[PDB]
Amino acid sequence: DVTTHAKIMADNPSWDGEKTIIITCSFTPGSCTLTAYKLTPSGYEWGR
Amino acid sequence: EAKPKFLSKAEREAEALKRRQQEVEERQRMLEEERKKRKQFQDLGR
């Protein structure tokens, strides 16, 4: 997910790394757990 | 203000051209400030 997000960021300059997130809707038993994550500037450089 | 003035069709479309030039100028300004924010985010990890 951080490589996908950082490749999308590196190829599209309209994706500001402060404002763009990855919400993950994980399928827990009988439910859904949502967690939003942001890329730090270390993470965008590594995932790029 | 309160009383609506008549504006001619040439004057109306000149006002509309000036309006759309304004907001395409602030779209350009927001896009180059977006490039500035992007360069700032990029070199804090590099």
Curated annotation (Swiss-Prot), chain A:
Signal sequence coordinates: none
Tissue occurrence: Widely expressed.
Superkingdom of the organism of origin: Eukaryota
Subcellular location: Nucleus; Nucleus speckle
Subunit comment: Part of the U5 snRNP complex. Component of the U4/U6-U5 tri-snRNP complex composed of the U4, U6 and U5 snRNAs and at least PRPF3, PRPF4, PRPF6, PRPF8, PRPF31, SNRNP200, TXNL4A, SNRNP40, DDX23, CD2BP2, PPIH, SNU13, EFTUD2, SART1 and USP39. Component of the U5.U4atac/U6atac snRNP complexes in U12-dependent spliceosomes. Within the minor spliceosome, which acts on U12-type introns, interacts with PPIL2 and RBM48. Core component of U2-type precatalytic, catalytic and postcatalytic spliceosomal complexes. Found in a mRNA splicing-dependent exon junction complex (EJC) with SRRM1.
Role, per record: Plays a role in pre-mRNA splicing as core component of precatalytic, catalytic and postcatalytic spliceosomal complexes, both of the predominant U2-type spliceosome and the minor U12-type spliceosome. Functions as a scaffold that mediates the ordered assembly of spliceosomal proteins and snRNAs. Required for the assembly of the U4/U6-U5 tri-snRNP complex, a building block of the spliceosome. Functions as a scaffold that positions spliceosomal U2, U5 and U6 snRNAs at splice sites on pre-mRNA substrates, so that splicing can occur. Interacts with both the 5' and the 3' splice site.
Disease: Retinitis pigmentosa 13: A retinal dystrophy belonging to the group of pigmentary retinopathies. Retinitis pigmentosa is characterized by retinal pigment deposits visible on fundus examination and primary loss of rod photoreceptor cells followed by secondary loss of cone photoreceptors. Patients typically have night vision blindness and loss of midperipheral visual field. As their condition progresses, they lose their far peripheral visual field and eventually central vision as well.
Notes concerning its domains: The MPN (JAB/Mov34) domain mediates interaction with TSSC4 and SNRNP200. Has structural similarity with deubiquitinating enzymes, but lacks the residues that would bind the catalytic metal ion.
Name this polypeptide is given: Pre-mRNA-processing-splicing factor 8
Gene: PRPF8
UniProtKB/Swiss-Prot annotation, chain B:
Compartments in which it is found: Nucleus; Chromosome
Modification after translation (UniProt): In vitro phosphorylated by CLK1 and U1 snRNP-associated protein kinase. Phosphorylated by SRPK2 and this phosphorylation is required for its association with the tri-snRNP (U4/U6-U5 tri-small nuclear ribonucleoproteins) and subsequent spliceosomal B complex formation. May be phosphorylated by SRPK2 on Ser residues in the SR domain; the phosphorylation is required for the removal of inappropriate R-loops during transcription.
Protein name as it appears in the record: Probable ATP-dependent RNA helicase DDX23
Binding partners and assembly: The phosphorylated form (by SRPK2) is a component of the U4/U6-U5 tri-snRNP complex composed of the U4, U6 and U5 snRNAs and at least PRPF3, PRPF4, PRPF6, PRPF8, PRPF31, SNRNP200, TXNL4A, WDR57, SNRNP40, DDX23, CD2BP2, PPIH, SNU13, EFTUD2, SART1 and USP39. Identified in the spliceosome C complex. Interacts with ERBB4. Interacts with ERCC6.
Function: Involved in pre-mRNA splicing and its phosphorylated form (by SRPK2) is required for spliceosomal B complex formation. Independently of its spliceosome formation function, required for the suppression of incorrect R-loops formed during transcription; R-loops are composed of a DNA:RNA hybrid and the associated non-template single-stranded DNA.
Family: Belongs to the DEAD box helicase family. DDX23/PRP28 subfamily.
